[PDB]
CSV table of N, CA, C and O and ligand atoms in Angstrom, one decimal:
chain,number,residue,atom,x,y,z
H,1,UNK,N,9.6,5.6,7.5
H,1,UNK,CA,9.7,4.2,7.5
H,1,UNK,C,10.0,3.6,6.2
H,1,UNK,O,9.5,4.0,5.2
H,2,UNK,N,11.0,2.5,6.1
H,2,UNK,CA,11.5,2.0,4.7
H,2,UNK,C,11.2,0.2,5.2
H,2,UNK,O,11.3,-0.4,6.2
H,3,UNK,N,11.0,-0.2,3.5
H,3,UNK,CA,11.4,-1.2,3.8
H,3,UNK,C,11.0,-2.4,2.6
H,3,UNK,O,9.9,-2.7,2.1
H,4,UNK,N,12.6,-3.1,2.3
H,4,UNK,CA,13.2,-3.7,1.2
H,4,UNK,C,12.5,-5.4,1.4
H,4,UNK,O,12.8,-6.3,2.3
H,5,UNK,N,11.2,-5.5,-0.3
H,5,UNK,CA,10.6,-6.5,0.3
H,5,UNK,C,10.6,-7.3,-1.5
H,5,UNK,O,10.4,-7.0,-2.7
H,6,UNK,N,10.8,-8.5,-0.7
H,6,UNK,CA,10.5,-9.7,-2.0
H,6,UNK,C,8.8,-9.9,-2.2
H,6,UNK,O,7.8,-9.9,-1.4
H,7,UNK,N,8.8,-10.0,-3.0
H,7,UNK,CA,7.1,-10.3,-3.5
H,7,UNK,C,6.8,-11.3,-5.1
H,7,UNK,O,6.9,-11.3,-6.3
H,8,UNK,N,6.4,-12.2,-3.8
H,8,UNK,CA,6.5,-13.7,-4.9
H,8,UNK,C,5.5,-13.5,-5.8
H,8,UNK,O,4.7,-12.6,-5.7
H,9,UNK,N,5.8,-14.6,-6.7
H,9,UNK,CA,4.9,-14.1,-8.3
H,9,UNK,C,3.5,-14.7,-8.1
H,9,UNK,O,3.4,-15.8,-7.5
H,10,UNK,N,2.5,-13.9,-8.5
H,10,UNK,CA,1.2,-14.0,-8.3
H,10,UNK,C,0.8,-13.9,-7.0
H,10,UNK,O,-0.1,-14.5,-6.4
H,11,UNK,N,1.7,-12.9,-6.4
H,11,UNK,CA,1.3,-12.5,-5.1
H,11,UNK,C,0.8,-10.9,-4.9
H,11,UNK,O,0.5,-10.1,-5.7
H,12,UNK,N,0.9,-10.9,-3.6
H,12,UNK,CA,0.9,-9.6,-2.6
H,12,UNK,C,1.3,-9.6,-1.5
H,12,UNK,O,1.5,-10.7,-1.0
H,13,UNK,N,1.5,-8.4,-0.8
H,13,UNK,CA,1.6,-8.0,0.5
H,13,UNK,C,1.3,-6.7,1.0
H,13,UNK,O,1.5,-5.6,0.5
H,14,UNK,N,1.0,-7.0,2.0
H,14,UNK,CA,0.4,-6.0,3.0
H,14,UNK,C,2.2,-5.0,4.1
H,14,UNK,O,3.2,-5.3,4.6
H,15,UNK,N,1.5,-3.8,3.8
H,15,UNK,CA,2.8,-2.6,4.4
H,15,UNK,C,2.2,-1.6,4.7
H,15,UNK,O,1.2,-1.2,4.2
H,16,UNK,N,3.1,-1.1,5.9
H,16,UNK,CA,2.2,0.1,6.1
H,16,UNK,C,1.1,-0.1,7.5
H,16,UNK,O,1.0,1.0,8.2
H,17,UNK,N,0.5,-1.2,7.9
H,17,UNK,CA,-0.7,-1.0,8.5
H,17,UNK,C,-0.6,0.4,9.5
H,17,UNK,O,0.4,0.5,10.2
H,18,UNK,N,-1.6,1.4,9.5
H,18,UNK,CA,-1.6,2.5,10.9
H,18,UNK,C,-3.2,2.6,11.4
H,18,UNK,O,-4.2,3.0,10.7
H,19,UNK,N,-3.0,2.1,12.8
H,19,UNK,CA,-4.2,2.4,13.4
H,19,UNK,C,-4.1,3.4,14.2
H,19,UNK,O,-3.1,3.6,15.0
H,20,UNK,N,-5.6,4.6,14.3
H,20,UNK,CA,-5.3,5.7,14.9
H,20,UNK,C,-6.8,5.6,15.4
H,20,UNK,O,-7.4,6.7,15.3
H,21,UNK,N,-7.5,4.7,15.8
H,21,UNK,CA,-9.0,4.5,15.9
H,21,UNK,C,-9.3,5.7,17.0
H,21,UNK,O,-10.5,5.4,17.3
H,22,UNK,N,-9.1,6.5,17.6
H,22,UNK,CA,-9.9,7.5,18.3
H,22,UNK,C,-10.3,8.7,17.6
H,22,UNK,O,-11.4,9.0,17.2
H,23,UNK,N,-8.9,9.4,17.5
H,23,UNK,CA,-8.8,10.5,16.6
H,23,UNK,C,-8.0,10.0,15.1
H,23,UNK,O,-6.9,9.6,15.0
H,24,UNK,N,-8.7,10.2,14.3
H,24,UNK,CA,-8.4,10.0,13.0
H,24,UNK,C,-7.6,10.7,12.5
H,24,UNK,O,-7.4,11.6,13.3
H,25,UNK,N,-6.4,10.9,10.9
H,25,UNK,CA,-5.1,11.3,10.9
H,25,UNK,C,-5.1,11.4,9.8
H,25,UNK,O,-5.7,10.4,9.3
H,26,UNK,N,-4.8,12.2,8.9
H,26,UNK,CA,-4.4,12.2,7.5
H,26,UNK,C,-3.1,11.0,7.6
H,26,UNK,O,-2.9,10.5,8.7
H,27,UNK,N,-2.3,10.5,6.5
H,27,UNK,CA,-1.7,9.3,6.2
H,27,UNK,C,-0.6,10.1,5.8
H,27,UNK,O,-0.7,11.3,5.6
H,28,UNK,N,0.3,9.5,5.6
H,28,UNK,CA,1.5,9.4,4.2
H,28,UNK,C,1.3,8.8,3.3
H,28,UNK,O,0.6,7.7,3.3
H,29,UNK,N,2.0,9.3,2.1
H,29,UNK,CA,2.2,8.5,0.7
H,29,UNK,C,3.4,7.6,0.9
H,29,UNK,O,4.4,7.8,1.6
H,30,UNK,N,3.1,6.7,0.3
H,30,UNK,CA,3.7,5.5,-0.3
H,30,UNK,C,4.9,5.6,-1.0
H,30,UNK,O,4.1,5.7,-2.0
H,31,UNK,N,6.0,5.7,-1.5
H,31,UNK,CA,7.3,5.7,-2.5
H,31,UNK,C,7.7,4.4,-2.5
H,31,UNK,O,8.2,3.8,-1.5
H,32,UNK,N,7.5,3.6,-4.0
H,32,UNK,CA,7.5,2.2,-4.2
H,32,UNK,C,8.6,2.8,-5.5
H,32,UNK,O,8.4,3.7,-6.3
H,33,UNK,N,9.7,2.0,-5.4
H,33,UNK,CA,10.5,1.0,-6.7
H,33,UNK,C,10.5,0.3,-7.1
H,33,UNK,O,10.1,-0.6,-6.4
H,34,UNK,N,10.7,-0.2,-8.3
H,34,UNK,CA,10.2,-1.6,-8.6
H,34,UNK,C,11.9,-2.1,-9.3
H,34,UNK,O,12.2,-1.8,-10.4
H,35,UNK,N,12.4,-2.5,-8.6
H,35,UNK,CA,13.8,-2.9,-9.1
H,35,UNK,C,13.7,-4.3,-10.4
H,35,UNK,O,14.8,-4.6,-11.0
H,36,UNK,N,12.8,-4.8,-10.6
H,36,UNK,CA,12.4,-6.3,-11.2
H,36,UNK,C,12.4,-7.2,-9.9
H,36,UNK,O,12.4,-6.9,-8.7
H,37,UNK,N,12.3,-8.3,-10.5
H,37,UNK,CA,12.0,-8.6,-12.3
H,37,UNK,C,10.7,-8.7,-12.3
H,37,UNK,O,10.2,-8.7,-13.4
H,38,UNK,N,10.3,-8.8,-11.8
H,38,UNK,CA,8.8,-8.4,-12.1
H,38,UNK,C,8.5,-7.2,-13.1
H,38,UNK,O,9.3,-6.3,-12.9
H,39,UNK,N,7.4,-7.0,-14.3
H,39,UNK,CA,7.6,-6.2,-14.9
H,39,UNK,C,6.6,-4.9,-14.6
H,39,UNK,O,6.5,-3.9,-15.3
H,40,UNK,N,6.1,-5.3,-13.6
H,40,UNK,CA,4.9,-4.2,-12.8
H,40,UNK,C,4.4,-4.9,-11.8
H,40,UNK,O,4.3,-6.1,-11.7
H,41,UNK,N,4.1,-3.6,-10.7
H,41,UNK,CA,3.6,-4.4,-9.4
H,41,UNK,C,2.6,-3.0,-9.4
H,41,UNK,O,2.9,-2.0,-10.1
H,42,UNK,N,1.4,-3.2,-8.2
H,42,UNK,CA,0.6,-2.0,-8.4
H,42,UNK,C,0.2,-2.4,-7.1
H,42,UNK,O,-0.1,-3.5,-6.6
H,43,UNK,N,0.6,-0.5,-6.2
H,43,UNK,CA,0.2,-0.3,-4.8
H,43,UNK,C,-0.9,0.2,-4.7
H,43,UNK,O,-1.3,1.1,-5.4
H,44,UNK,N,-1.4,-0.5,-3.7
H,44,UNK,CA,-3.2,0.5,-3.7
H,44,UNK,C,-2.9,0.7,-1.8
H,44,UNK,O,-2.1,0.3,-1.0
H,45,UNK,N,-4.0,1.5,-2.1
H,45,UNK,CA,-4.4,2.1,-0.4
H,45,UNK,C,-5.7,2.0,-0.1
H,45,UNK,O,-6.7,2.4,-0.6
H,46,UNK,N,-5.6,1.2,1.0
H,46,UNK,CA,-6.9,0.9,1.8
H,46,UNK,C,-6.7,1.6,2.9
H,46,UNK,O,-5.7,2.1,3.5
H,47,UNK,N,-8.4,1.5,3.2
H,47,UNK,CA,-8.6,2.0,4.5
H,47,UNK,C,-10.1,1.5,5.6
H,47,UNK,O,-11.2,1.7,5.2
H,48,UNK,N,-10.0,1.2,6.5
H,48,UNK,CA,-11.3,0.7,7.2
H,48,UNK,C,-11.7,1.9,8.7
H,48,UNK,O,-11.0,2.8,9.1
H,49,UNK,N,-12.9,1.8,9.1
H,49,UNK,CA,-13.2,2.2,10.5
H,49,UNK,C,-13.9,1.0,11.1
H,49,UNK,O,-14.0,-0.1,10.6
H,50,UNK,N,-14.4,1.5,12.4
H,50,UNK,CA,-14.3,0.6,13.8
H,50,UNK,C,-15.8,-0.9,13.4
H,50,UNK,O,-15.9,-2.0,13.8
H,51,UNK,N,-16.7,-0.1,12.5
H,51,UNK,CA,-17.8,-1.4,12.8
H,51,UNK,C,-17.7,-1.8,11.2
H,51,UNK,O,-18.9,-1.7,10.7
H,52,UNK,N,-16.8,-2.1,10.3
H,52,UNK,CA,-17.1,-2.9,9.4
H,52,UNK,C,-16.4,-3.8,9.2
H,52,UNK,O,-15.2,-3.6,9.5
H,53,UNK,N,-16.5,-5.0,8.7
H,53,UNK,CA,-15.6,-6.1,8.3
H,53,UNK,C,-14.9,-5.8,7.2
H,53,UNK,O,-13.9,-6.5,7.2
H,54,UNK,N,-15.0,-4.7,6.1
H,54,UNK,CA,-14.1,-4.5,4.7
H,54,UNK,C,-13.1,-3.1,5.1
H,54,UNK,O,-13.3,-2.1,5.8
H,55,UNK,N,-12.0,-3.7,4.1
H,55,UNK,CA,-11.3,-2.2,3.9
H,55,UNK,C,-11.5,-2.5,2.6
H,55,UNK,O,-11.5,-3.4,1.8
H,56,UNK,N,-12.0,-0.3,2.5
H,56,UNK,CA,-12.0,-0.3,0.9
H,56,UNK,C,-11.0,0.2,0.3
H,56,UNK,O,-10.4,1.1,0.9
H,57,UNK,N,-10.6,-0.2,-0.9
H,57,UNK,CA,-9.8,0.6,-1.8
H,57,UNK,C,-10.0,2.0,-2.5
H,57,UNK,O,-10.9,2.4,-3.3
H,58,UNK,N,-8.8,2.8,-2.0
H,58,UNK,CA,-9.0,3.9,-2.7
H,58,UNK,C,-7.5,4.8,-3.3
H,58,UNK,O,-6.9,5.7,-2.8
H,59,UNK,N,-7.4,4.2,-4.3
H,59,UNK,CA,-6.2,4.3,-4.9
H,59,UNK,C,-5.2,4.0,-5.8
H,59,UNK,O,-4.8,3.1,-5.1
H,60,UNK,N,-4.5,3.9,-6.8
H,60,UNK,CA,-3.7,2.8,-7.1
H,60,UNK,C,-2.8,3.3,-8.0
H,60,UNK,O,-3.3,4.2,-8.6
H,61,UNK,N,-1.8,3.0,-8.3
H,61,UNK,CA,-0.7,3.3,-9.0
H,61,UNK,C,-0.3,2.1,-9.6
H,61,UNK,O,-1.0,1.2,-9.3
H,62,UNK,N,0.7,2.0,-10.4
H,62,UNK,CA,1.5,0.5,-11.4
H,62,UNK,C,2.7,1.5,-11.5
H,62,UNK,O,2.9,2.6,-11.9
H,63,UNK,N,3.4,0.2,-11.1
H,63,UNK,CA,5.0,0.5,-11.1
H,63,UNK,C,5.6,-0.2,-11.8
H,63,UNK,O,5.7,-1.3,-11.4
H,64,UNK,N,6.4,0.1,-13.2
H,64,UNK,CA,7.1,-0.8,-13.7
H,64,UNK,C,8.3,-0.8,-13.4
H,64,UNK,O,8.8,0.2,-12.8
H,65,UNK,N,9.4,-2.4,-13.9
H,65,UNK,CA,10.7,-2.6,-14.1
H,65,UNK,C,11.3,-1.2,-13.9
H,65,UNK,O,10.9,-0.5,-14.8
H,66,UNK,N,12.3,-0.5,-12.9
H,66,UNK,CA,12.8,0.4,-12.9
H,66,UNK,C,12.3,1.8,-12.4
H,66,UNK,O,13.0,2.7,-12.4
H,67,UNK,N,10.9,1.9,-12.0
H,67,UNK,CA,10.5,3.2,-12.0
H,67,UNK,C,10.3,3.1,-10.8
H,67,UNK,O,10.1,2.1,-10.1
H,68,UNK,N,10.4,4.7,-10.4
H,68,UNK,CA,10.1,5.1,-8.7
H,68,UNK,C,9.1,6.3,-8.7
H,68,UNK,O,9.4,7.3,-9.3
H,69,UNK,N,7.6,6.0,-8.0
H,69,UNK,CA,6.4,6.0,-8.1
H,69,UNK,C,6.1,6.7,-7.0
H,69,UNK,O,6.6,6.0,-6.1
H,70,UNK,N,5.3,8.0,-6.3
H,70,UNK,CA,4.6,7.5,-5.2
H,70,UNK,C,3.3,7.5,-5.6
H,70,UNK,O,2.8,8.1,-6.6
H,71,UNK,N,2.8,6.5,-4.9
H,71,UNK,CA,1.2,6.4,-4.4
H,71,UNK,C,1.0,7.6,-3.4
H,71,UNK,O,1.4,7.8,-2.3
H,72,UNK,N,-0.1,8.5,-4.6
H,72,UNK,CA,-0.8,9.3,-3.4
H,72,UNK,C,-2.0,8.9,-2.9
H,72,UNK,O,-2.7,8.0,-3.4
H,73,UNK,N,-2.3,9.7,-1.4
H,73,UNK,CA,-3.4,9.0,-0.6
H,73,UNK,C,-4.4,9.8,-0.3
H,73,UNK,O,-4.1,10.9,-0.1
H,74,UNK,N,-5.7,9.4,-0.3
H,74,UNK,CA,-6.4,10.9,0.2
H,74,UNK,C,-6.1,11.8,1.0
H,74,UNK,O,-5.0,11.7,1.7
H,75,UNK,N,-6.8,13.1,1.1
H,75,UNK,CA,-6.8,14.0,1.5
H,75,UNK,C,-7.2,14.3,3.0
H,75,UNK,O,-6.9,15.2,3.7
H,76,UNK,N,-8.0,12.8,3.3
H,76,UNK,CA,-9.3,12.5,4.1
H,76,UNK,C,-8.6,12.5,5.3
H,76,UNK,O,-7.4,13.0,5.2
H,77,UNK,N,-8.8,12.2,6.2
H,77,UNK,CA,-8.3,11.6,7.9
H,77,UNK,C,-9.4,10.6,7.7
H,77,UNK,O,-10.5,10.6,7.0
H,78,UNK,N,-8.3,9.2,8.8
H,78,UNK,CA,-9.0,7.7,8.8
H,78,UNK,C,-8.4,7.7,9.9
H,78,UNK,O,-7.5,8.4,10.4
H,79,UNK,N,-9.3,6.3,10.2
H,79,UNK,CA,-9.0,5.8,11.7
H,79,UNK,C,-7.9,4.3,11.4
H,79,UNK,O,-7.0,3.9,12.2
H,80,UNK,N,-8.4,3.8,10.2
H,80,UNK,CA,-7.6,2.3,10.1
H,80,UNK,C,-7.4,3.0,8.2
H,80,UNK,O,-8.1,3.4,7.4
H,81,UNK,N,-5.6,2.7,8.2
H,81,UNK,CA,-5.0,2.2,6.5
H,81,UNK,C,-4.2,1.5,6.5
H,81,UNK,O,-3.9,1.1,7.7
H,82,UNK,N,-3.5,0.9,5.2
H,82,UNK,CA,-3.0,0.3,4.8
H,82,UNK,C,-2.7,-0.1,3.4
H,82,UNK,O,-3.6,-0.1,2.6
H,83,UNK,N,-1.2,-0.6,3.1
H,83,UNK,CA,-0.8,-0.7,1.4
H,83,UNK,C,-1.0,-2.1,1.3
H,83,UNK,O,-0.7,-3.0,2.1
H,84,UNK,N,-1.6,-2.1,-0.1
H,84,UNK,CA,-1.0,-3.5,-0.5
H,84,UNK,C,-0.2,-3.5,-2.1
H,84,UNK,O,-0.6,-2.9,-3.1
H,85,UNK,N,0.9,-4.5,-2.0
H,85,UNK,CA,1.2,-4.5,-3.7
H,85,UNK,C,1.1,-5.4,-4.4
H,85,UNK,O,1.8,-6.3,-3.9
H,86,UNK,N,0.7,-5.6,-5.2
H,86,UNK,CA,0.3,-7.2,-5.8
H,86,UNK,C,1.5,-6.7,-7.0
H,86,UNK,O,2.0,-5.7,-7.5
H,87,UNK,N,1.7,-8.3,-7.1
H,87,UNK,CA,2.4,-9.0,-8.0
H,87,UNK,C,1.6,-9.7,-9.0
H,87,UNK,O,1.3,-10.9,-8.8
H,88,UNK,N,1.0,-9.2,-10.2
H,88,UNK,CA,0.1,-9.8,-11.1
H,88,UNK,C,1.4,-10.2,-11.7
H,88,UNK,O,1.4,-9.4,-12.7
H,89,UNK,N,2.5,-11.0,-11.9
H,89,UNK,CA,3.6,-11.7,-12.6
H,89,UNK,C,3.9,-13.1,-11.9
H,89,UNK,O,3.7,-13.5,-10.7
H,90,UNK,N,4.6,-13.6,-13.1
H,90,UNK,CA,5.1,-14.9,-13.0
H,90,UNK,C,7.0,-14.2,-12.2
H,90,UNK,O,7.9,-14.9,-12.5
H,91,UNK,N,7.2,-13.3,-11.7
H,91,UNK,CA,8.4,-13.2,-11.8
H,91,UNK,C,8.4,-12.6,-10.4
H,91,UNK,O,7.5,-11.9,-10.0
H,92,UNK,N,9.7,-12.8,-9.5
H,92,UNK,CA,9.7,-12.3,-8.0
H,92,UNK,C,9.5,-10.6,-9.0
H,92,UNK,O,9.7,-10.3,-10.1
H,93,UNK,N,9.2,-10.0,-7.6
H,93,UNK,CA,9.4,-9.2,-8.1
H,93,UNK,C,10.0,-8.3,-6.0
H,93,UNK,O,9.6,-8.3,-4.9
H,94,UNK,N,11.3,-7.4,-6.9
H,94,UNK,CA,12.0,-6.7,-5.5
H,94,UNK,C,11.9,-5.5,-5.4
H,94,UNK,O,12.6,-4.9,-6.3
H,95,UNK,N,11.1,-4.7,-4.3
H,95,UNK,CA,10.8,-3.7,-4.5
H,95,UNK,C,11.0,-2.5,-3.1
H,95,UNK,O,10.4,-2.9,-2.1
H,96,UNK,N,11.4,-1.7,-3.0
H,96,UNK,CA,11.4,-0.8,-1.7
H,96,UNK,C,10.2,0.0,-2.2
H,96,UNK,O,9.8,0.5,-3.3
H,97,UNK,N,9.9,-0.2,-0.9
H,97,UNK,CA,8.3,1.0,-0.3
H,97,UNK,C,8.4,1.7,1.4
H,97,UNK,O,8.2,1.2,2.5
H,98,UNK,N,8.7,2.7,0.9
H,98,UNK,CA,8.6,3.8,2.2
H,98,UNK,C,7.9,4.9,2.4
H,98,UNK,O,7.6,5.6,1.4
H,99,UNK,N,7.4,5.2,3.7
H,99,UNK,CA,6.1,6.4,3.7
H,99,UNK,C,7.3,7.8,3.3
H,99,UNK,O,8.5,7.9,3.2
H,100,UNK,N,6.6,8.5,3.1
H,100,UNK,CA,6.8,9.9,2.4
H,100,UNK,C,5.8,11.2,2.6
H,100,UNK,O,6.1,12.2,2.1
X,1,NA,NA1,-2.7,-16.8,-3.9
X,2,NA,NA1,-14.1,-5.4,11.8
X,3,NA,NA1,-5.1,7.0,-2.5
C-alpha cells in the first residue's frame, strides 16, 4: 500500500490504520520520504486492543528534507495499529509512506 500525502505545518496525520481484533498479526514497516519542505517529519507507531480508550506509542523515527527512512515496528502481534506523522514545522511538508 502507498500513499502520496500533504501534511500541513504544525500538523499530523493518521496512515495505515489495520484492525485484526480476533487473531492478532505481526504489522509491516512503514517507508516514509520526506521530499520538503518541511525540514523533518517523525513517524511513530501505535497500537491499541479491544478494552482500552489509548493507543500507545511504540516507536519513532525523524525523517529529514530528502531522506528515505523505514519505521520499524515491533516484533509483537496486535489486534489494533496504526502511523502517525507529525509535522513539528512551519512548512507543508510532502511526503510518501508505504507499508513494506
Ligand atoms: Na493542531
Ligand atoms: Na476503546
Ligand atoms: Na515500532
Amino acid at each position: 500500500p502507498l500513499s502520496e500525502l500533504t501534511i500541513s505545518p504544525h500538523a499530523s496525520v493518521e496512515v495505515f490504520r489495520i484492525d485484526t481484533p480476533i487473531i492478532p498479526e505481526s504489522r509491516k514497516s512503514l517507508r516514509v520520504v520526506n521530499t520538503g519542505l518541511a525540514n523533518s517529519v517523525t513517524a511513530k507507531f501505535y497500537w491499541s486492543h479491544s478494552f482500552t480508550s489509548e493507543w500507545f506509542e511504540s516507536g519513532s523515527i525523524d525523517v529529514g528534507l530528502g531522506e528515505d527512512k523505514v519505521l520499524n515496528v515491533p516484533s509483537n502481534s496486535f489486534y489494533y495499529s496504526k502511523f502517525v506523522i507529525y509535522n513539528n514545522t512551519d512548512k507543508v511538508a510532502y511526503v510518501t509512506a508505504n507499508l513494506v
